Structure 1
Amino acid sequence: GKAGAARIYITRNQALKKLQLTLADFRRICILKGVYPREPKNKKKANKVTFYYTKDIQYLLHEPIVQKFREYKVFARKLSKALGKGELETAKRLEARKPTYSLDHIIKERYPTFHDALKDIDDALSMLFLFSTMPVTDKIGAATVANCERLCAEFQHYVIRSNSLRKAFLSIKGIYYQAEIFGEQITWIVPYKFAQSVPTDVDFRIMHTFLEFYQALMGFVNFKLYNTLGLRYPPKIDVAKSESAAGLAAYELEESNTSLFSNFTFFLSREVPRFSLEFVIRAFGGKVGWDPILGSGSPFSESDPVITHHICDRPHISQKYEGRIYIQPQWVYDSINKGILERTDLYACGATLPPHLSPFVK
């Protein structure tokens, strides 16, 4: 009763009571740090409900996350006090000096080596990519969304520069990219740019906490990768280019089949998802051009005849030129996944699209 399997596991209420933290705070600490439920072999004996090891609860007792959470809550109450009393200056000044937190200790504890963080960054990359296109809402943070988009752009630029991308598959949910960094394999899913809507069914607080932890892990990984490759962390970003929807062109990679399409100048019109096509072409070492509608800062133009392949999903090309025969994104995706250039005639405009084989499927 008082010993054995009963002491082996701690109930959710018992663990919260020992840590003296609320359910929301405990969930945030568990999500930020490394803690998962552990069902004992003898559930009846473990209860003398969710079960957690006492070692995790013992470690979480001295965790500074709970203390930081109280400081944020205590400061928030003081900020509310100033607003009610009518002294706006006190609240405005106290806003700047509000408490914050650091995840460096948690990241080191959860991932002692960069290899473990890289292997566990597949979920972080997928979360960052998904949140990079989601609309700004009250639950989400506009600065957090911008930071996630910047982190995703920096990761794409680093992957393109290092040519770490290996496979690219076009799925219904989005684009699945498989890359090998430091031996570890990282898989990310980039949702398509569509007019989606909030399901209003999942917990926003849990998702935001997971996204914040994912962003911190992605930022630390990007800084380590930039230092290893000599790139400047963070890379320089052009404000004018960012306002012009230049994509990765704004993020300058300033220094502080990897050539499947190297001898090719791909061009994309305003009818295909050039966000993923440009990244795939850049990761392959080739040159990717986009129409002015898709974005600014395009090195090439539509009238330029130097483009060997013109990517266009439209069924009609009134201004088709010579030497720039239309190709489909399926051929490019198949070529990237297989490492060998596909047949442009087979995937030409107005022709049947060949089936897309998933590179992850063996």
Structure 2
Amino acid sequence: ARVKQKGKAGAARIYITRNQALKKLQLTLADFRRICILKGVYPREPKNKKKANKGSTAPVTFYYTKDIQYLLHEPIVQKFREYKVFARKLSKALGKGELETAKRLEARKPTYSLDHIIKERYPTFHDALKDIDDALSMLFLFSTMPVTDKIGAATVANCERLCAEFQHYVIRSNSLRKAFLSIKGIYYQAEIFGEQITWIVPYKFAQSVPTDVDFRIMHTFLEFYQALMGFVNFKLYNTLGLRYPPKIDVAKSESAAGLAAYELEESNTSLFSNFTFFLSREVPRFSLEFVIRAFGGKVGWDPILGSGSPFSESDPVITHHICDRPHISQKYEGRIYIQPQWVYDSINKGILERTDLYACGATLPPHLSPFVKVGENDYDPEAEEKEEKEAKELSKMMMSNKQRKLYSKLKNENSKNENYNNALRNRKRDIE
């Protein structure tokens, strides 16, 4: 036969570099990245980088050639090219002083549907439910950010609608399980169709954009997740029988009704069912309304927090009055005054908590993260030497690859953390 040329097969033929993937697809980096966001594509490092790089050694990212060949026949790529054509016709229309033809061009702007992207990425609904948490984390993060010249106002409006619809489903289906409070925000943990969903909702505050993050990347992730959430919410509402999408009360939204604007008209889940909580004007209503209604508790809130309040301040039906302010001039009776951590501690532990310990002005019991599981020996907040050394310095003496070395991190880090938090109880007892 013929002499096989070196490096014509194997890793050199299976893996493709980023630049060679660019020239193969005839794409630019911004468009190649954008299609890689929408599809499921990512770098893959081979075992032998030098062999896969045709004998070179420069640090170069690798992709599967089969992954790139799958992008050769992507209908979205032709939509990127159609947008380039439209953008140039819009430029010519305005540059020639034809305003009306520019408006017509803007109306027929080429848009693409992510139907087949979702199908080919997530074949089954449970697959989507697995990697749905990252989408929910971002849509809630961007539902509270101000509008920019990078991210539009329509995108922000869609993020609020999709987030509110999902919250309405969880409240309606009582699928919420745990709600945890942290400095980052509020960690929610729910279960849908058996799969576990965990996301984070930040506190509404007038933050500032860090100006170091690239919002072009945020644009494509937002576009992908919004399409993903829309189809997920459509199925979930069909499963419950609710017509999708739920209607939007314009007047209620204009009055900042929050979740109350969207009415879901039909086409230990009862921890707080026999309770009527009240919300003062110092508490995260966007979080307390979600958890309490999800577990059955009826909710009334201060008028300045949003219209559509079923309860008033003077209504005696109030069972508990959540108020984080250290002073309440017009104290009521039969509406025992507690702190917000009381509710979320009750959610985490699945039991009613000590209202006396969580009363206004009292000390605050430590917050327990339900996501943290009890370790082997980690502290939960709520003649031999010769044989030992011989059995401990023989693998580092005789064993071939010394894979026993992993103990130097597995046991070391766990022991150090265990020693610290075990001695912490000794220090706190001594202080007491």
**Quick check: TM above 0.5?**
yes
| Cα deviation code 1:188-240 (max 9, x no counterpart) | 10000011100011110111110111111111110000001101110111000
How far, CA to CA, are the matches of 1:184 and 1:225 in structure 2?
Answer: 13
Please report how far the alpha carbon of residue 256 of structure 1 lies from its aligned counterpart in structure 2 after TM superposition. 1.0
| Cα deviation code 1:110-160 (max 9, x no counterpart) | 000000101100000000110110111111111101100100000000000
The reply to whether residue 14 of structure 1 matches residue 20 of structure 2 is yes
Q: TM-score by structure 1 length?
A: 0.99
Please report how far the alpha carbon of residue 52 of structure 1 lies from its aligned counterpart in structure 2 after TM superposition. 0.4
How far, CA to CA, are the matches of 1:148 and 1:232 in structure 2?
Answer: 19
Tell me which residue corresponds to 1:70.
81
Q: In 1, are the aligned partners of 2:320 and 2:335 still within 8 Å (CA)?
A: yes
Please report how far the alpha carbon of residue 84 of structure 1 lies from its aligned counterpart in structure 2 after TM superposition. 0.5
| Cα deviation code 1:295-316 (max 9, x no counterpart) | 1101101111100000000001
How far, CA to CA, are the matches of 1:196 and 1:352 in structure 2?
Answer: 30
Please report how far the alpha carbon of residue 106 of structure 1 lies from its aligned counterpart in structure 2 after TM superposition. 0.2
Q: Secondary structure at the match of 1:14?
A: helix
Q: In 1, are the aligned partners of 2:14 and 2:66 still within 8 Å (CA)?
A: no
2:153 to 131, 138, 142: 142
How far, CA to CA, are the matches of 2:272 and 2:134 in structure 1?
Answer: 29
How far, CA to CA, are the matches of 1:130 and 1:298 in structure 2?
Answer: 26
Q: Following TM superposition, where does structure 1 have runs of at least 4 consecutive aligned residues deviating by more than 4 angstroms?
A: none
Identical-residue share of aligned pairs (%): 100
Q: In 1, are the aligned partners of 2:278 and 2:300 still within 8 Å (CA)?
A: yes
How far, CA to CA, are the matches of 1:59 and 1:267 in structure 2?
Answer: 55
| Within-5 A mapping of 1:44-63 | 44-48=50-54, 49-63=60-74
| Within-5 A mapping of 1:327-346 | 327-346=338-357
How far, CA to CA, are the matches of 1:104 and 1:181 in structure 2?
Answer: 22
Q: Secondary structure at the match of 2:212?
A: coil
The reply to whether residue 39 of structure 1 matches residue 45 of structure 2 is yes
The total of aligned residue pairs comes to 362
| Cα deviation code 1:301-347 (max 9, x no counterpart) | 11111000000000011111111111111010011111111111111
| Cα deviation code 1:273-298 (max 9, x no counterpart) | 01100000111011011101111101
Q: Secondary structure at the match of 2:199?
A: strand
How far, CA to CA, are the matches of 1:35 and 1:107 in structure 2?
Answer: 13
Please report how far the alpha carbon of residue 26 of structure 1 lies from its aligned counterpart in structure 2 after TM superposition. 0.6
How far, CA to CA, are the matches of 2:283 and 2:148 in structure 1?
Answer: 27
Tell me which residue corresponds to 2:178.
167
How far, CA to CA, are the matches of 2:151 and 2:240 in structure 1?
Answer: 33
| Cα deviation code 1:153-185 (max 9, x no counterpart) | 000000000000000000101000000000000
How far, CA to CA, are the matches of 2:161 and 2:357 in structure 1?
Answer: 37
How far, CA to CA, are the matches of 2:175 and 2:288 in structure 1?
Answer: 16
Q: Secondary structure at the match of 1:293?
A: helix
How far, CA to CA, are the matches of 2:8 and 2:218 in structure 1?
Answer: 37
How far, CA to CA, are the matches of 1:12 and 1:103 in structure 2?
Answer: 24
Gaps of 5+ in 2: 1-6, 55-59, 374-432
Q: Secondary structure at the match of 2:190?
A: strand
How far, CA to CA, are the matches of 1:261 and 1:254 in structure 2?
Answer: 24
Please report how far the alpha carbon of residue 2 of structure 1 lies from its aligned counterpart in structure 2 after TM superposition. 2.1
Q: In 1, are the aligned partners of 2:43 and 2:62 still within 8 Å (CA)?
A: yes
How far, CA to CA, are the matches of 2:325 and 2:216 in structure 1?
Answer: 41
Please report how far the alpha carbon of residue 73 of structure 1 lies from its aligned counterpart in structure 2 after TM superposition. 1.3
Q: Secondary structure at the match of 1:62?
A: coil
Q: In 1, are the aligned partners of 2:277 and 2:298 still within 8 Å (CA)?
A: yes
| Cα deviation code 1:48-91 (max 9, x no counterpart) | 11100011101000001211011011101100110010011110
Q: In 1, are the aligned partners of 2:150 and 2:216 still within 8 Å (CA)?
A: yes
Tell me which residue corresponds to 1:274.
285
How far, CA to CA, are the matches of 2:115 and 2:348 in structure 1?
Answer: 36
How far, CA to CA, are the matches of 2:98 and 2:226 in structure 1?
Answer: 36
How far, CA to CA, are the matches of 1:168 and 1:22 in structure 2?
Answer: 43
Q: Secondary structure at the match of 1:289?
A: strand
Please report how far the alpha carbon of residue 37 of structure 1 lies from its aligned counterpart in structure 2 after TM superposition. 0.6
How far, CA to CA, are the matches of 1:97 and 1:207 in structure 2?
Answer: 25
Please report how far the alpha carbon of residue 94 of structure 1 lies from its aligned counterpart in structure 2 after TM superposition. 1.0
How far, CA to CA, are the matches of 1:22 and 1:34 in structure 2?
Answer: 18
How far, CA to CA, are the matches of 1:352 and 1:76 in structure 2?
Answer: 62
- CA RMSD, 1 decimal: 0.7
How far, CA to CA, are the matches of 1:213 and 1:314 in structure 2?
Answer: 41
How far, CA to CA, are the matches of 1:147 and 1:62 in structure 2?
Answer: 30
Tell me which residue corresponds to 2:209.
198
How far, CA to CA, are the matches of 1:77 and 1:336 in structure 2?
Answer: 56
Q: In 1, are the aligned partners of 2:14 and 2:64 still within 8 Å (CA)?
A: yes
Q: Secondary structure at the match of 1:10?
A: strand
The higher radius of gyration belongs to 2
Gaps of 5+ in 1: none
Q: In 1, are the aligned partners of 2:118 and 2:228 still within 8 Å (CA)?
A: yes
Q: In 1, are the aligned partners of 2:319 and 2:336 still within 8 Å (CA)?
A: yes
How far, CA to CA, are the matches of 2:364 and 2:343 in structure 1?
Answer: 12
Q: TM-score by structure 2 length?
A: 0.83
How far, CA to CA, are the matches of 1:3 and 1:138 in structure 2?
Answer: 48
